[PDB]
């Protein structure tokens, strides 16, 4: 099944570079969608549930205010997230259906994940059973095998960015911190609790930081809380760099072993960063029962299937105040976002 994987990534790389070098642009217009309800807001602007007026298909539309993006100094970040979304294709990566812009905003119309934010589900149940956590972890492992083969580093893995779809599978969202790089980079970015030691420290780092983040995720999913936490980020960094980790007593021995190899301060030993690469992870005992191809094919029964009343149902998301989408009579930051 190894020959197929190598063959799979080969074609995947071919399809990726064609789109990466020739990105799609202006594939739709705002008036084609009816705004329904806001699913989330904040710095990233806002994500609304919308409905294509003719097909009746529902989507999650991320709206960014150009002037705001400039103020936040996120110009390159936003252009890059879109360039990446339109070029990638993987079962667990959220799909970009359409993208366009007008005088005031930038829009990314993506596939809607009805199930809700993983964050919500975790804080709701407390913690996921090891089998439940494993089902999700497997999807991430494959997603990172895919992304890393394209020299793409994610850099913002966390329950907050993982959506749950109708079949209970994952949809990774937000690539505003992702980057295409072979070798090392130095940017301090990400979410405090999930930063690898080498990101906090001034020295450069590589894709190995995604594998450390995977360790933090598995740990939070199975414990109900992260391995390193405190009131303030600087205190959290202190704990991370020390690397002292304690595990709940209910953690199986093999789970602790896997975590010891992922939350490994020494790169020469961190799983995912050795000679056998991702295979050290896929062949670890904790994953003994995992049917990798079946996961990729979405054939495995999800241990948790979120409720779903309809394709336009938003009962699995929080409530937000609605705000009129205003479009300035004048074009703003045309030069800055010409590539979008």
């Amino acid at each position: 099944e190894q020959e197929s994987v190598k063959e799979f990534l080969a074609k995947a790389k071919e399809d990726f570079l064609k789109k990466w070098e020739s990105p799609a642009q202006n594939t739709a217009h705002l008036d084609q969608f009816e705004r329904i309800k806001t699913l989330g807001t904040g710095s990233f602007g806002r994500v609304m549930l919308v409905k294509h007026k003719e097909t009746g298909n529902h989507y999650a539309m991320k709206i960014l205010d150009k002037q705001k993006v400039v103020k936040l100094k996120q110009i390159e970040h936003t252009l890059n997230e879109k360039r990446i979304l339109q070029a990638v294709n993987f079962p667990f990566l959220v799909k970009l259906e359409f993208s366009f812009k007008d005088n005031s905003n930038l829009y990314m119309v993506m596939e809607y994940a009805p199930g809700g934010e993983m964050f919500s589900h975790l804080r709701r149940i407390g913690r996921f059973s090891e089998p439940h956590a494993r089902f999700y972890a497997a999807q991430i492992v494959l997603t990172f095998e895919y992304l890393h083969s394209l020299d793409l580093i994610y850099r913002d893995l966390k329950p907050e960015n993982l959506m749950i779809d109708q079949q209970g599978y994952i949809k990774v969202t937000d690539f505003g911190f992702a980057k295409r790089v072979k070798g090392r980079t130095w940017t301090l970015c990400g979410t405090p609790e999930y930063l690898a030691p080498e990101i906090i420290l001034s020295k450069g780092y590589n894709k190995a930081v995604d594998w450390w983040a995977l360790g933090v995720l598995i740990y939070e999913m199975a414990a109900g809380y992260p391995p390193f936490f405190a009131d303030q980020p600087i205190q959290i960094y202190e704990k991370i760099v020390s690397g002292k980790v304690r595990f709940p007593s209910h953690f199986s021995s093999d789970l602790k072993d896997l975590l010891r190899n992922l939350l490994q301060v020494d790169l020469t030993k961190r799983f995912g960063n050795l000679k056998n690469g991702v295979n050290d992870i896929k062949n670890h005992k904790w994953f003994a029962t995992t049917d990798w191809i079946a996961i990729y094919q979405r054939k495995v029964e999800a241990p948790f299937i979120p409720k779903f009343k309809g394709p336009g149902d938003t009962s699995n998301f929080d409530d937000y105040e609605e705000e009129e989408i205003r479009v300035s009579i004048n074009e703003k930051c045309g030069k800055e976002f010409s590539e979008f």
Binding site: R123, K158, C189, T191, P192, Y225, F229, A230, P233
Partner: peptide, 19 residues
């Protein structure tokens, strides 16, 4: 316990990325 500490940490809600 660790759980109790987390519950009182002020960081149980959605966590933003660093800016």
């Amino acid at each position: 316990t660790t759980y109790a500490d987390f519950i009182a940490s002020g960081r149980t809600g959605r966590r933003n990325a660093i800016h």
